[PDB]
Amino acid sequence: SMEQVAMELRLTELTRLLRSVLDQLQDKDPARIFAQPVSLKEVPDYLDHIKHPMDFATMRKRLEAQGYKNLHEFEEDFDLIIDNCMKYNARDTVFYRAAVRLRDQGGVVLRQARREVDSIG
């Protein structure tokens, strides 16, 4: 149907805008602390602590399969990256601090992305 095509074009354009958002958020992580999944070889207890691991590569796979239907879904996964790190790592650690900085800086980007998603539809 033509309606199904039009919905698919909206999903494609959302995907475009989320790819740009993802690039911008990832730049706020120059140390690359959040680039890849936490290794279960190197942190064998991780899944005892963290039930829903997340990282930028995993988000990028979901994005490229057009697996985010709305901004809320995408923000949920970003929040898991931050929140998981802030639970597993203590306040005095480079990891925790990196997550705080990513959250603070990412907030700016996400605030305007919400306006753009509402605005363009």
Contacts of residue 117, defined as CB under 8 A and 6 or more positions apart, other chains included, come to 14, 17, 70, 71
What experimental approach yielded this model?
X-ray
Reply yes or no on domain 1-121 having CATH 1.20.920.10: yes
Which spans in 1-121 are helix H?
2-26, 46-49, 56-64, 71-88, 94-120
54: left (phi over 0), alpha (psi -120 to 50) or beta: beta
CB atoms within 10 A of CB 102: 21
The answer to whether the CB of 102 falls within 8 A of the CB of 116 is: no
